[PDB]
């Protein structure tokens, strides 16, 4: 399409590309945090059910 159209598109796509990308790290960071949070936690939940099992 006319260059505009392309741009228009593009514009957004680029944006997206950022936005998503942004969201990607943003998430990744959150995610990362969450990742951290798992250690004692891991145990902790694992623990949590850890007995309706034996008994």
């Amino acid at each position: 399409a006319t260059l505009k159209d392309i741009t228009r598109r593009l514009k957004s796509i680029k944006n997206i590309q950022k936005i998503t990308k942004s969201m990607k790290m943003v998430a990744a960071a959150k995610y990362a945090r969450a990742e951290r949070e798992l250690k004692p936690a891991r145990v902790y939940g694992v623990g949590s059910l850890a007995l309706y099992e034996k008994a």
Binding site: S12, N15, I19, M23
Partner: protein, 237 residues
């Protein structure tokens, strides 16, 4: 030539409606070829600028009256890089770019707000209340455009909330500009509602003050001054 009579001679503050100079220019351009001449890029007439220039400069405010020139400019494909408008701006003093998008947004006044400009505006000239309200407005709305981009992900009632407030406000604001037409029972149905200026500045200033941040959003649409918009909310429920 007539108007110059009135201006200087009859003194008159002329309101000069031109619809459209565009057609003149175009007319010039049409001939250009046939004048043997080269037309121009974008088809034009090579002399366009002077043509305009001499014309635009033909009219003015002397100390022998004023010709206040309301000049309709058709803007093809609303493309303005479209040399003619591109030029025009120089001769403009206030540019009113009417936004078809906005028109499409159902708004009437359908204007392109940010491009209906006057390079002139000032916190001095128009007073800052005016000015600032506008800059704030101009600001937020452009930012709101940035936000559209968000919304595309986030949805009709889901975002980041302050930002949501402002969004909503933008939605009001939009509506608040919308204004009935006495003429246009055909476009509006409504009848014109005129806003005397202060009531406007204030109108938005108030909205900016968020005094309606609990009032409905399109309880702003096709109004006159802001009160009536408040009133209008009631009329619903």
């Amino acid at each position: 030539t007539v108007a110059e009579y009135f201006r200087d001679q009859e003194g008159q503050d002329v309101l000069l409606f031109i619809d459209n100079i565009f057609r003149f220019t175009q007319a010039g351009s049409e001939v250009s070829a046939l004048l043997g001449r080269i037309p121009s890029a974008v088809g034009y007439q090579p002399t366009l600028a002077t043509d305009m220039g001499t014309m635009q400069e033909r009219i003015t405010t002397t100390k022998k009256g004023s010709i206040t020139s309301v000049q309709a400019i058709y803007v093809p494909a609303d493309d303005l890089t479209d040399p003619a408008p591109a030029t025009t701006f120089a001769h403009l003093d206030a540019t009113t770019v009417l936004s078809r998008a906005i028109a499409e947004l159902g708004i009437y006044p359908a204007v392109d707000p940010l491009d209906s400009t006057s390079r002139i505006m000032d916190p001095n000239i128009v007073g800052s209340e005016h000015y600032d309200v506008a800059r704030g407005v101009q600001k937020i709305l452009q930012d709101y455009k940035s936000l559209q981009d968000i919304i595309a992900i986030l949805g009709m009632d889901e975002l980041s909330e302050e930002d949501k407030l402002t969004v909503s406000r933008a939605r009001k604001i939009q509506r608040f500009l919308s204004q009935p037409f006495q003429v246009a029972e055909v476009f509006t149905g409504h009848l014109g509602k005129l806003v005397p200026l202060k009531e406007t500045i204030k109108g938005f200033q108030q909205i900016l003050a968020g005094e309606y941040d609990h009032l409905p959003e399109q309880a702003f649409y096709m109004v006159g001054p802001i009160e009536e918009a408040v009133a209008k909310a009631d009329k619903l429920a």
